[PDB]
């Protein structure tokens, strides 16, 4: 999908596998063109802490 | 589940704003949501698509077509992924007045 | 992950069927990654055709049999500025 | 212990070259070495230079 994916190969416990990685805008971007606050991630996917 | 409900939520918030820019309900209003217990956890995510539609109905205020069962997992751009157990799920819906 | 964001940061499609991997280090230097052989086999299975790997790993990739390397066209890289410039020509 | 594994590997591979193989007197040279024990693993040179 043109905006938000790139194939990521990965060495899971049983042979390699072609994971995808997917992201999306979580909110309208320009409610405030001038108000200045950072846009933090929300990572998911049962991540390990590392 | 706590992750899967979240990814479904973000996809809801994305789909709607792409679809109906004027409506802004779902971006800004607290929303309590209930998921009755009963799925086996490996099969737990299987009901993911229903959440993605529930929030949308609460936006538009329009009921679904009636007695329209539906299942299937969702990922962050709506690519439904295969789910197991089709036998029991089908026969279960058959006794609930399911149509479609 | 880096190009996962940057694509979204421009709306630009990524170049088609171009798997990649490796680790970045907060200034764009890339680092060696393990598991190279099984990774590239999996990339073969999915039909990928422009795989990208860290330059520091290169020595391992050419230990592979000729039929495995057939049809892939690896572009080794070292610093992330290159990967961006093949990914979005 | 790890060097103890290496020199063993090099030696026994030389033995295989003797007992059935060609040379009657294997002659290891550093240029030769990557044959016997494969490709170099570590190259610990500092990443950044400037």
Curated annotation (Swiss-Prot), chain C:
Family: Belongs to the peptidase S16 family.
Active-site residues (renumbered): 39
Expression by tissue: Duodenum, heart, lung and liver, but not thymus.
Gene name of the encoded protein: LONP1
Binding partners and assembly: Homohexamer. Organized in a ring with a central cavity. The ATP-binding and proteolytic domains (AP-domain) form a hexameric chamber, while the N-terminal domain is arranged as a trimer of dimers. DNA and RNA binding is stimulated by substrate and inhibited by ATP binding. Interacts with TWNK and mitochondrial DNA polymerase subunit POLG.
Effect of residue 34 to A: Has low basal, but normal stimulated ATPase activity, and retains peptidase activity
Reported impact of residue 35 to A/S: Enhances the basal, but not the stimulated ATPase activity, and retains peptidase activity
Record organism: Homo sapiens
Comment field on protein domains: The Lon N-terminal domains are crucial for the overall structure of the protein, maintaining it in a conformation allowing its proper functioning. The AP-domain (ATP-binding and proteolytic domains) has a closed-ring conformation in the presence of AMP-PNP and its N-terminal entry gate appears closed. Upon ADP binding, it switches to a lock-washer conformation and its N-terminal gate opens.
Protein name: Lon protease homolog, mitochondrial
Function: ATP-dependent serine protease that mediates the selective degradation of misfolded, unassembled or oxidatively damaged polypeptides as well as certain short-lived regulatory proteins in the mitochondrial matrix. Endogenous substrates include mitochondrial steroidogenic acute regulatory (StAR) protein, DELE1, helicase Twinkle (TWNK) and the large ribosomal subunit protein MRPL32/bL32m. MRPL32/bL32m is protected from degradation by LONP1 when it is bound to a nucleic acid (RNA), but TWNK is not. May also have a chaperone function in the assembly of inner membrane protein complexes.
Disease: CODAS syndrome: A rare syndrome characterized by the combination of cerebral, ocular, dental, auricular, and skeletal features. These include developmental delay, craniofacial anomalies, cataracts, ptosis, median nasal groove, delayed tooth eruption, hearing loss, short stature, delayed epiphyseal ossification, metaphyseal hip dysplasia, and vertebral coronal clefts.
From Swiss-Prot, chain D:
Tissue distribution of the protein: Duodenum, heart, lung and liver, but not thymus.
Subcellular localization: Mitochondrion matrix
Domain of life: Eukaryota
Role of this protein: ATP-dependent serine protease that mediates the selective degradation of misfolded, unassembled or oxidatively damaged polypeptides as well as certain short-lived regulatory proteins in the mitochondrial matrix. Endogenous substrates include mitochondrial steroidogenic acute regulatory (StAR) protein, DELE1, helicase Twinkle (TWNK) and the large ribosomal subunit protein MRPL32/bL32m. MRPL32/bL32m is protected from degradation by LONP1 when it is bound to a nucleic acid (RNA), but TWNK is not. May also have a chaperone function in the assembly of inner membrane protein complexes.
Quaternary data: Homohexamer. Organized in a ring with a central cavity. The ATP-binding and proteolytic domains (AP-domain) form a hexameric chamber, while the N-terminal domain is arranged as a trimer of dimers. DNA and RNA binding is stimulated by substrate and inhibited by ATP binding. Interacts with TWNK and mitochondrial DNA polymerase subunit POLG.
Illness: CODAS syndrome: A rare syndrome characterized by the combination of cerebral, ocular, dental, auricular, and skeletal features. These include developmental delay, craniofacial anomalies, cataracts, ptosis, median nasal groove, delayed tooth eruption, hearing loss, short stature, delayed epiphyseal ossification, metaphyseal hip dysplasia, and vertebral coronal clefts.
Entry's free-text remark on domains: The Lon N-terminal domains are crucial for the overall structure of the protein, maintaining it in a conformation allowing its proper functioning. The AP-domain (ATP-binding and proteolytic domains) has a closed-ring conformation in the presence of AMP-PNP and its N-terminal entry gate appears closed. Upon ADP binding, it switches to a lock-washer conformation and its N-terminal gate opens.
Similarity section: Belongs to the peptidase S16 family.
Official protein name in the record: Lon protease homolog, mitochondrial
Organism expressing this protein natively: Homo sapiens (Human)
